[PDB]
Coordinates of C-alpha atoms in Angstrom, one line a residue:
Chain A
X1 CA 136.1 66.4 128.7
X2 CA 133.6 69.2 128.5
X3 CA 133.8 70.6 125.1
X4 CA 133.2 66.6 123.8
X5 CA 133.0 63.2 125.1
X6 CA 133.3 59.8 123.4
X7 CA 131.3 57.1 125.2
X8 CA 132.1 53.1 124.7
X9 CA 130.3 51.7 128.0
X10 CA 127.5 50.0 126.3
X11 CA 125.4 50.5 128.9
X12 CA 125.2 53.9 128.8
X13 CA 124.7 54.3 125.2
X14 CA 122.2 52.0 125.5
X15 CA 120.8 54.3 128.0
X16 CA 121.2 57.7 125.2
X17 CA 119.6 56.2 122.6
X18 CA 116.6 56.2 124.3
X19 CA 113.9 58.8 121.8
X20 CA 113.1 60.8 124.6
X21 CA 116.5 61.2 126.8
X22 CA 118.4 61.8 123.3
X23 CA 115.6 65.1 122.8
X24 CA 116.7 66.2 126.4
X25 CA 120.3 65.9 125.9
X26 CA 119.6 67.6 122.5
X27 CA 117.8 70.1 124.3
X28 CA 120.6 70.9 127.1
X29 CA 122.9 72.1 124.9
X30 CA 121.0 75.3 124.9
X31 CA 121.3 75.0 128.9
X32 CA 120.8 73.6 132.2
X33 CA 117.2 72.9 133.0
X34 CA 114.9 71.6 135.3
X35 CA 112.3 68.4 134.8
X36 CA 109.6 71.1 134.8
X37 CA 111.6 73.1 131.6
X38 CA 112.1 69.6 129.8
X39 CA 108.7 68.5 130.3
X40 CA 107.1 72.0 128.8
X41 CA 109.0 71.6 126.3
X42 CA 109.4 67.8 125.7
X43 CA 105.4 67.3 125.9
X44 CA 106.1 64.8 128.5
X45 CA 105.2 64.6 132.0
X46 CA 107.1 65.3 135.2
X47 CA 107.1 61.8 136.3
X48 CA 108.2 60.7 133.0
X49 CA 110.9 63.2 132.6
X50 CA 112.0 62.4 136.0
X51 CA 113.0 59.1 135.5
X52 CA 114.5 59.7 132.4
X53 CA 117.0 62.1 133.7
X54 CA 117.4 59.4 136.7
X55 CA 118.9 57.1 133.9
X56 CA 121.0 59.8 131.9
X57 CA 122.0 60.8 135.7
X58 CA 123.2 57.6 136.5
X59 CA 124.7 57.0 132.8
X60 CA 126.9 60.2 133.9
X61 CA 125.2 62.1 131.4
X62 CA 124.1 64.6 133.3
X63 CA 124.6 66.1 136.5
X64 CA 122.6 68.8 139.2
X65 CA 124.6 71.7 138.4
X66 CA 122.9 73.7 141.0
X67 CA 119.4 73.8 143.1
X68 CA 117.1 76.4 142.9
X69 CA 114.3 76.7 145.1
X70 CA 111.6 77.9 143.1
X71 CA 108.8 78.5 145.2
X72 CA 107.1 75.9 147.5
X73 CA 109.2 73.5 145.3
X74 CA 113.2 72.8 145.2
X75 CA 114.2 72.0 141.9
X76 CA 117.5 70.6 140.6
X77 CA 119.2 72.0 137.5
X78 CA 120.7 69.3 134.9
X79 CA 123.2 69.9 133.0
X80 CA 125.1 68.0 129.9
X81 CA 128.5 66.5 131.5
X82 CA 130.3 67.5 128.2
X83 CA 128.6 69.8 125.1
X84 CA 129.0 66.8 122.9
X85 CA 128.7 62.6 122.7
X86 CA 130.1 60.6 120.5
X87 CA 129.4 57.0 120.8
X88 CA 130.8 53.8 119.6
X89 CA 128.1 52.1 118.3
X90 CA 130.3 49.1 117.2
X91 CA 132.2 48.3 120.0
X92 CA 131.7 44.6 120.2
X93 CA 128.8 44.6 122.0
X94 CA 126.2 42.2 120.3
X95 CA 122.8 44.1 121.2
X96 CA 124.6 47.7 120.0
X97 CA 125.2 45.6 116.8
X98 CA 121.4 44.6 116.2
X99 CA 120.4 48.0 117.8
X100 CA 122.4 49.6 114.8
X101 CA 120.9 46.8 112.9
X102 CA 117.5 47.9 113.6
X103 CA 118.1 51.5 112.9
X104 CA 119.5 50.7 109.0
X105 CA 116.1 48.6 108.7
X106 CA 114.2 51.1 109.3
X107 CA 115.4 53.4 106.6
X108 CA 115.5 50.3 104.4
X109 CA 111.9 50.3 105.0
X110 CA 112.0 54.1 104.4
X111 CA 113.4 52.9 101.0
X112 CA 111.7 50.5 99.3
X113 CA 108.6 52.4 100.9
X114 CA 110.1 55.1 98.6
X115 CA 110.4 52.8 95.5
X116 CA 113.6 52.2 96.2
X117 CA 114.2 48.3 94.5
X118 CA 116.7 46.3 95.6
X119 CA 117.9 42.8 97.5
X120 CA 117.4 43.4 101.4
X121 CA 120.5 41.7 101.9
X122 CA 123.5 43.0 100.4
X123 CA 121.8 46.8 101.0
X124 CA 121.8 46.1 104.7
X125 CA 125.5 44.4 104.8
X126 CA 126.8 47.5 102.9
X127 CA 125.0 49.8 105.6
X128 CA 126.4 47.8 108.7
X129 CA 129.7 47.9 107.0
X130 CA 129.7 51.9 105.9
X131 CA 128.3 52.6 109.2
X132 CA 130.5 50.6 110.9
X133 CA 133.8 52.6 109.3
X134 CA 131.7 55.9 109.8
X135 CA 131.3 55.1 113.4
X136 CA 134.8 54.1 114.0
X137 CA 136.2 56.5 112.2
X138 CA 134.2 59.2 113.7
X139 CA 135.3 57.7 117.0
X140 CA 139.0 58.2 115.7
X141 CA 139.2 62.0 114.8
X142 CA 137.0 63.3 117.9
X143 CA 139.0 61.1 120.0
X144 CA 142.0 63.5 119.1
X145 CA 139.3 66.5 119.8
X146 CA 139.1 65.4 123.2
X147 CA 142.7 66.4 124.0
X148 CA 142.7 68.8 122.0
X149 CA 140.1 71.0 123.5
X150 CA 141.8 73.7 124.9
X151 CA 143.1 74.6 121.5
X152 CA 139.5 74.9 120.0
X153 CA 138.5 77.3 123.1
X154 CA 137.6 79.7 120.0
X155 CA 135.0 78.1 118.1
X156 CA 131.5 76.7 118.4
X157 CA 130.5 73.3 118.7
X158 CA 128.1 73.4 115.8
X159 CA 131.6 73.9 113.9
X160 CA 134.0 71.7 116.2
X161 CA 131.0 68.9 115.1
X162 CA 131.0 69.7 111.3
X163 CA 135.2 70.0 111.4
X164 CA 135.1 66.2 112.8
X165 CA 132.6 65.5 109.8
X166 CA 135.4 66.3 107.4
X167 CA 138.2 65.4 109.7
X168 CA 136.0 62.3 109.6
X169 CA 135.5 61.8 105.8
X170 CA 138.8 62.5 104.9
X171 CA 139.8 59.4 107.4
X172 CA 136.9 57.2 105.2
X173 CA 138.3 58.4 101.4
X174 CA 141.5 56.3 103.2
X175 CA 140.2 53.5 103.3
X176 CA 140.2 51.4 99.9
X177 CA 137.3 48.9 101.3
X178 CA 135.3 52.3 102.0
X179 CA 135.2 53.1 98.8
X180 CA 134.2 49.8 97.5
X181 CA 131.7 50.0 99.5
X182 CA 130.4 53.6 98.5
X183 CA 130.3 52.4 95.4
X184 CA 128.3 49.5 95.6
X185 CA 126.1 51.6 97.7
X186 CA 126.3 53.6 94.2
X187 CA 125.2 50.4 92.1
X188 CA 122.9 49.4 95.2
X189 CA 120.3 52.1 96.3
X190 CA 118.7 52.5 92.4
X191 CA 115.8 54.8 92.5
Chain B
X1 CA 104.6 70.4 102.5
X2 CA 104.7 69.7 105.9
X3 CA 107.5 67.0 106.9
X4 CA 109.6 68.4 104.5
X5 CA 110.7 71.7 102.3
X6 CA 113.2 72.7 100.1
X7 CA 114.3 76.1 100.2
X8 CA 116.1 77.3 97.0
X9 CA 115.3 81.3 97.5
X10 CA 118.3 82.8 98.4
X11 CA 117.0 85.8 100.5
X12 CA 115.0 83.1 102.8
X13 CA 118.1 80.9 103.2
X14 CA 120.8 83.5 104.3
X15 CA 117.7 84.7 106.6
X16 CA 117.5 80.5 108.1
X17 CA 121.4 80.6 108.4
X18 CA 121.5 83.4 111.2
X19 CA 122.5 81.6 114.3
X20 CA 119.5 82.3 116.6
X21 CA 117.2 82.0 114.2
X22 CA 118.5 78.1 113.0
X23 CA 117.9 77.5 117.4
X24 CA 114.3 78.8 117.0
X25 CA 114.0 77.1 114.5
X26 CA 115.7 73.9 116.1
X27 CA 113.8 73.7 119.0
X28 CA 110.2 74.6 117.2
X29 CA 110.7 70.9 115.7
X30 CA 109.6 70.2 119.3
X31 CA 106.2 72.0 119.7
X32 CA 105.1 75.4 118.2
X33 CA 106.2 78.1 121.2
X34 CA 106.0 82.1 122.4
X35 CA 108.6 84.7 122.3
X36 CA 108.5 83.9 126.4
X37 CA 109.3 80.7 125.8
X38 CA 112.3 80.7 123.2
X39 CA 113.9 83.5 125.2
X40 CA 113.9 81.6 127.9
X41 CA 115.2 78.9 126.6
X42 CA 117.7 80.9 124.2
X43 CA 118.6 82.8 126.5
X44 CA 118.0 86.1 124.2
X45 CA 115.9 88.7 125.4
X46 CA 112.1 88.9 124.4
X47 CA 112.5 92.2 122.1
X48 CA 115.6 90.2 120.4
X49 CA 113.1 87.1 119.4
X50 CA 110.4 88.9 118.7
X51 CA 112.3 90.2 115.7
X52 CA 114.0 87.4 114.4
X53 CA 110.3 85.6 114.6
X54 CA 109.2 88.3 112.3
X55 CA 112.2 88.0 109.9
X56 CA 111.8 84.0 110.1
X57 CA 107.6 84.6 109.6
X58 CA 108.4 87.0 106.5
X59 CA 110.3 84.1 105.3
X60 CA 107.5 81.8 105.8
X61 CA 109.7 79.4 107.9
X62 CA 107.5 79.8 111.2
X63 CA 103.8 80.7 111.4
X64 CA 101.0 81.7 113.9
X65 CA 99.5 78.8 115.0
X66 CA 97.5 80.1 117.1
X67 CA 97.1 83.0 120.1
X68 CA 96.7 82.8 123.4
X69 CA 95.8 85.0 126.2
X70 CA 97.9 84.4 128.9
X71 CA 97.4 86.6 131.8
X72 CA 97.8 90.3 130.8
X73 CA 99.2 89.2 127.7
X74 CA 98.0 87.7 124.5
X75 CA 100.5 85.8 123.3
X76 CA 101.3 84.0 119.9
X77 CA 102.6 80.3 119.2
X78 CA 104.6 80.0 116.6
X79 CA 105.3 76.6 114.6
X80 CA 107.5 75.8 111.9
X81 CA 106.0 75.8 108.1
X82 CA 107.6 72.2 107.8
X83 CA 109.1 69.8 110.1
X84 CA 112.8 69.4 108.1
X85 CA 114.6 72.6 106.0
X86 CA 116.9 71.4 103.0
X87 CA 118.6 74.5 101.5
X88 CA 120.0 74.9 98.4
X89 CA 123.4 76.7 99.6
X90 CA 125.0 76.4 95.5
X91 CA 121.7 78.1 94.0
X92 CA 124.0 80.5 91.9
X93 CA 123.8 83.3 94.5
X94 CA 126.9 85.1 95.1
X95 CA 126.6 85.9 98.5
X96 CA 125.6 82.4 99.5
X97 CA 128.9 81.0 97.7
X98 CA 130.7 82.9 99.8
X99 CA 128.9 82.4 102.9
X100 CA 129.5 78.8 102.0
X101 CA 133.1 79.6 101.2
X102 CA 133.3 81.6 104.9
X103 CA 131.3 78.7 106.7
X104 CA 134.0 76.1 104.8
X105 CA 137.1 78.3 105.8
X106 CA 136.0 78.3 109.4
X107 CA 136.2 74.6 109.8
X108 CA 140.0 74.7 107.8
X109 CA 140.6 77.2 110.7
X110 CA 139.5 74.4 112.9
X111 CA 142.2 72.0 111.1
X112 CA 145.2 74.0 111.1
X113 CA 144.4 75.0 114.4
X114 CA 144.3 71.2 115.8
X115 CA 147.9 70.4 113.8
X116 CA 146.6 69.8 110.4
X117 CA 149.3 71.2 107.8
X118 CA 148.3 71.7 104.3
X119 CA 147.6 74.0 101.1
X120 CA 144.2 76.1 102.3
X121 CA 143.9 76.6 98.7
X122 CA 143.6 73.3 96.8
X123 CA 141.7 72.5 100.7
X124 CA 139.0 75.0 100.8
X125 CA 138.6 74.5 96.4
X126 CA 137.8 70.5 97.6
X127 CA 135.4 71.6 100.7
X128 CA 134.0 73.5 98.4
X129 CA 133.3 71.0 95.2
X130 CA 132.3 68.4 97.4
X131 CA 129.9 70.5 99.5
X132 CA 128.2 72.0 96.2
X133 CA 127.5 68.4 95.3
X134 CA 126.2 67.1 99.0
X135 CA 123.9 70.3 98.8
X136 CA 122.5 69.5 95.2
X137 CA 122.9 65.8 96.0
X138 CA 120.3 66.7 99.3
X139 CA 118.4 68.8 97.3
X140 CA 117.5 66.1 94.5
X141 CA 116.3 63.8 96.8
X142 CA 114.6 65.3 99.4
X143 CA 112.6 67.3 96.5
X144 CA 111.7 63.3 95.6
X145 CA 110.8 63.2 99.5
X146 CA 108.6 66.4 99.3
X147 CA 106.8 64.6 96.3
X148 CA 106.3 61.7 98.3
X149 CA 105.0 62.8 101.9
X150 CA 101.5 60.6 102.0
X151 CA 104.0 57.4 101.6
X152 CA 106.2 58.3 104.7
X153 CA 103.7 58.8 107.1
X154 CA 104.3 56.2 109.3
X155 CA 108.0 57.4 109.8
X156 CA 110.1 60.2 112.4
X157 CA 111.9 62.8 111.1
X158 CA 114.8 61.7 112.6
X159 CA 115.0 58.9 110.1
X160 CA 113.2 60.4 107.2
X161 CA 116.5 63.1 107.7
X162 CA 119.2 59.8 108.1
X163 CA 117.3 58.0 104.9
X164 CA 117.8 60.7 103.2
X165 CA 121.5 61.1 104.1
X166 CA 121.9 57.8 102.4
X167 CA 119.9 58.5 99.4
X168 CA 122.1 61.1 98.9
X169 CA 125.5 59.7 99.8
X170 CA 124.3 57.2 96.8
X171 CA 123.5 59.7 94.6
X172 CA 127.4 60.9 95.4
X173 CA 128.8 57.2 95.3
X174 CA 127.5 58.1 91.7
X175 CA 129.4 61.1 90.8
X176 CA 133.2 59.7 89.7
X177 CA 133.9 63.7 90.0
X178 CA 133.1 62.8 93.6
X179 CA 134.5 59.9 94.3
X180 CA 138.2 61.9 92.8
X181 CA 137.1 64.8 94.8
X182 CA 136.8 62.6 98.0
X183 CA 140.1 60.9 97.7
X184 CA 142.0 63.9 97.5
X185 CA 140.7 65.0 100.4
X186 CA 141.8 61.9 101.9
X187 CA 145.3 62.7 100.3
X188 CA 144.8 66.5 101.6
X189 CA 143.1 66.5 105.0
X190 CA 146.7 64.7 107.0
X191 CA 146.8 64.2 109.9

């Protein structure tokens, strides 16, 4: 809706995952700005910022609220379609699966670049897995939030987010295989 | 040091907690800014940020980088002391336990308030347990982190922050007091 929004379509959460368009959605939350805002703030250029916004346009992302001219220069106003996304980063889709693959790498890296000791393989399957129920279940509780919106009118979304944390959590200390797999995580990730 | 910093004084924290002051902070991850440009990107007033960058810079958690004259005015950029805060919220201080406490009750406002029935009691006593032990869980190994800065420069913030998320949920997947604590949330937190 607008409070929060759980995407599926691959495509476009391909499209969010992007470095920069995730640090202008970040930044929108504060409010609607133009490519010239983003850019002075994103270190990015105008052309580069453009495009990006094209795509998060096009994912339905974000939309011109409103255009201002500002000078000798007509600029459009963007605007988040809804003050939070939550995506389902394992729904089915095969690159999303290696994408999320790729992101647990690179803390693996993180890890044994830490001194962190350990076999690779199993560490990365328990990741996948955990991440897999975190994602789903996350998807789960804020898929309630969605209709429930109207009666969370009164609070923040820093606070609707960390209530689907718990919300969230609560779901995972359900689940007997999530807890197997915390703990291996447990026996797993040494130090 | 620099990509990250534990903050265990008290006075500093409850000062890094005020609402505005966590979105200055927030958005200086981006680039070190002016009063100009915060307000208008906060939408506060300049008089309103110029005092909660002075509260912020007494509490060492934003610096002058550096200042420039623009125009008729010489203004200051200010840049975070570190690129990631970790705060120790269950430092012994009274006033933070029951900032905690407040923060935690919020969210159980949240769950009654989206059709979640239960005892607010044995609830906000299990918030509570579990958060102390995610804060001194985060603390432990991002203080490892701080001690090991030179290894992790060839990494984001983003995913120094989600390794050490992990890290820590291991440390928990380590605490049996935990893993109790989490299921009866899961027996708690309904549905």
């Amino acid at each position: 809706a607008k409070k929060v929004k759980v995407i599926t379509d691959p495509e476009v959460i391909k499209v969010m995952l992007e470095d920069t368009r995730r640090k202008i959605l970040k930044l929108l939350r504060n409010k609607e700005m133009t490519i010239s805002q983003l850019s002075e703030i994103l270190g990015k250029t105008p052309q580069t910022i453009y495009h990006h916004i094209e795509k998060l346009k096009e994912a339905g992302l974000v939309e011109v609220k409103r255009t201002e001219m500002k000078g000798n220069l007509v600029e459009k106003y963007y605007g988040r379609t809804a003050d939070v996304f939550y995506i389902n980063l394992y729904l089915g889709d095969e690159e999303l699966r290696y994408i999320a693959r790729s992101r647990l790498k690179t803390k693996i890296d993180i890890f044994k670049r830490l001194g962190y000791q350990f076999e690779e393989n199993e560490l990365l399957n328990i990741m996948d897995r955990m991440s897999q129920k975190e994602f789903d279940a996350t998807v789960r509780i804020s898929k309630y939030i969605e209709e429930k919106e109207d009666a969370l009118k009164d609070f923040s979304n820093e606070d609707i987010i960390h209530a689907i944390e718990w919300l969230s959590t609560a779901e995972l200390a359900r689940d007997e295989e999530y807890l197997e797999l915390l703990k291996r995580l447990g026996s797993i990730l040494k130090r």
